[PDB]
Each structure stands twice: as structure tokens, then as C-alpha cells.
């Protein structure tokens, strides 16, 4: 997962 990518959180930004």
C-alpha cells in the first residue's frame, strides 16, 4: 500500500 502507498499512503501519501
Residue 4 DSSP SS3: coil
Cα-trace Rg, the chain: 4
Helix, strand, coil shares of the chain, percent, nearest 5, are 0, 0, 100
Method used to obtain the model: X-ray
Amino acid at each position: 500500500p502507498f499512503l501519501f
